[PDB]
Structures are given as structure tokens and as C-alpha cells.
Design a binder for this molecule. Structure first.
Ligand SMILES: C[C@H]1Oc2nc(cnc2N)-c2c(nc3ccc(C#N)cn23)CN(C)C(=O)c2ccc(F)cc21
Length: 292
């Protein structure tokens, strides 16, 4: 059985908390492999491994389980346990009732019917939450490689919501595919060119996430294909501010997208800047666009 190392500690499949299959009930589907809402009463999301899979899919599934179980931070989704001794195999995650962040932003956009559905402070709180998770990964020398709204989750739809990093599939793949599947629109120049990844890789991606958040869920680089973005970014091109985006917030984005990784902020600095934005009345009193 494959070993996993995080923060200098080794873990094995033996370390995963096996939950007896009889204690687990599926309730409804949520969305390779399926995801279900479930009960163990503790409410969970259940990732399943198709019984029709390759041995590599099996190892991938096991590794995903090891990776998430070894994290310990409030802004990374918890693993309640696994059910690997019955088929189909389950990974049991903290149930994030708010769903993924991208879908949330698109669905919760202010509208004439829901004029005050979201405010700048809601977005800054989401940004801070994920930056805190990223800081934890950084200080533990784990490179996420795919920081993007689709990979973040919310505890609940409502005001007290907390955002967390919820998917680690890219990092799992790299720990051990094709060009058309790479998250090019979230990657820095040295990443897709030399295949060099460092903590500053995640800083660049966080910048793109920030744009996703303040655009309220738009796809980055509107109207641009992957190759067009690659050439755009490699030549110094950067996204414009999202609609109504406060200058101080856009400025964090543009610092995250510095060409030289040494010139980009670490997450401690990003968190400090997000904090200062949240204090600034001119930032948080800015109205988000109302989509007609
Ligand atoms: C593996 C899956 O984990 C989870 N999904 C939801 C909630 N909690 C999870 N631990 C979750 C998702 N959508 C909804 C809708 C309603 C409710 C409730 N109640 C929960 N969810 C997102 N999703 C389908 C996903 O696969 C998805 C997308 C991104 C990600 F990072 C993780 C996940």
C-alpha cells in the first residue's frame, strides 16, 4: 500500500478512519465518480469510487483520502472518514451545505428580486477564508496547484457562511491527464512554461480566484481560449477589474499576478491586505452590480 507524506509525517491506508458501511446512509445525489449527501447523526458528503475503475483510479482515490485526512485547518474541508472495505468505496467529507463557491456566486448574484443578496463584505470574508487556508498550505509546504472557485465550498448559503478549500485532485495527480485539461487560466507563466511550481504558484492562482469572487462567478479572461490566455499572460497581459471592483481589491489581484514569483506576495501579506480592505469604508460601502 502507498505511503503519503505531509509536513514530514508519513501516513498509510491503515491511518484512515474506517467507518462501518452499515452506519452510512445515502440521502440524495449532489453531482468521475458521484457525490451524495449522506448520514453516519452526522451529516456528510460522500465521494464514491466507481466499481468499474482501473487500479490507478483506485490508487488515486486512496491518495485523495490520505491527503485530505492529514490536513488540520478550519478552512480546509474535514474528512470524517472512509469506507474502503466495501464496494463502491466511499470517502466521507464535511457536508458543506452552501455548495461550491462558483455556483454560489452565480446563483446568489444581486438582482431586482434579491437586491441585497450579497455585499462587498461577504466577498471579502470569502477571500479571507480561502487565503487563510492557502496560508496553512504554504506554511506546510504544500502546493495546491488549482486554487479556483470551483474547488472551494461554503458551509451554508447564509450570512455566517465559511469558505473552505474542498478539492485536491490536481495536487493528488502530481503527487501520483493532458494539455486540454490543465487549469491554464489559473496558472502563472513559469508554471505552464517551465513546469516550475512553488508556493508563489498558488499566489497567482489566488489572484485569479479573487477576480472570480469579485466578478461574482464569471469565467476568467472573458472570450479568451486557453491558448489565447497563455499568450496574453506570457506577454504581460492581465485581466481588467471586475465590474464595480474597489481599487484596493484590484490592487491585490495585480500584485498576485506579478511576472516574477519573487515579486508576488506570500499569503501572510495577502491576508494583511484583505484585512485592510475590509476595514476601509470606501471599499465595503461599494455596491455590487445588480444583474437585471
Ligand atoms: C466532493 C464534493 O464535496 C462536497 N460537496 C458539497 C458539499 N460538501 C462537500 N464536502 C456540495 C456541492 N454542491 C452541493 C449542493 C448542496 C449541498 C448540500 N447540502 C452540498 N453540495 C459541490 N459538489 C457537488 C462537488 O462535487 C464538490 C465540488 C467542489 C469541491 F471542492 C468538493 C465537492
Amino acid at each position: 500500500n502507498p505511503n503519503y507524506c505531509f509536513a514530514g509525517k508519513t501516513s498509510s491506508i491503515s491511518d484512515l478512519k474506517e467507518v462501518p458501511r452499515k452506519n452510512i446512509t445515502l440521502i440524495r445525489g449532489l453531482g468521475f465518480g458521484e457525490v451524495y449527501e449522506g448520514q453516519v447523526p452526522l451529516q456528510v458528503a460522500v465521494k464514491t469510487l466507481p466499481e468499474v475503475c482501473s487500479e490507478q483510479d483506485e490508487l488515486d482515490f486512496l491518495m485523495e483520502a490520505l491527503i485530505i485526512s492529514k490536513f488540520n485547518h478550519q478552512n480546509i474541508v474535514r474528512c470524517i472518514g472512509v469506507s474502503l472495505q466495501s464496494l463502491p468505496r466511499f470517502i466521507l467529507l464535511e457536508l458543506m451545505a452552501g455548495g461550491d463557491l462558483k455556483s454560489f456566486l452565480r446563483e446568489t448574484r444581486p438582482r431586482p428580486s434579491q437586491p441585497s443578496s450579497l455585499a462587498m463584505l461577504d466577498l471579502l470574508h470569502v477571500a479571507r477564508d480561502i487565503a487563510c487556508g492557502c496560508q496553512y498550505l504554504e506554511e506546510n509546504h504544500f502546493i495546491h496547484r488549482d486554487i479556483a472557485a470551483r474547488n472551494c465550498l461554503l458551509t451554508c448559503p447564509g450570512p455566517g457562511r465559511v469558505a473552505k478549500i474542498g478539492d485536491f485532485g490536481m495536487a493528488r495527480d502530481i503527487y501520483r491527464g493532458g494539455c486540454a485539461m490543465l487549469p491554464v487560466k489559473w496558472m502563472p507563466p513559469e508554471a505552464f512554461m517551465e513546469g516550475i511550481f512553488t508556493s508563489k504558484t498558488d499566489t497567482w492562482s489566488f489572484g485569479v480566484l479573487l477576480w472570480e469572487i469579485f466578478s461574482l462567478g464569471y469565467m476568467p479572461y472573458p472570450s479568451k481560449s486557453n491558448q489565447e490566455v497563455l499568450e496574453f499572460v506570457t506577454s504581460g497581459g492581465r485581466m481588467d477589474p471586475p465590474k464595480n471592483c474597489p481599487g484596493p481589491v484590484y490592487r491585490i489581484m495585480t500584485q498576485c499576478w506579478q511576472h516574477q514569483p519573487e515579486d508576488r506576495p506570500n499569503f501572510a501579506i495577502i491576508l494583511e491586505r484583505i484585512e485592510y480592505c475590509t476595514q476601509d469604508p470606501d471599499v465595503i460601502n461599494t455596491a455590487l452590480p445588480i444583474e437585471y
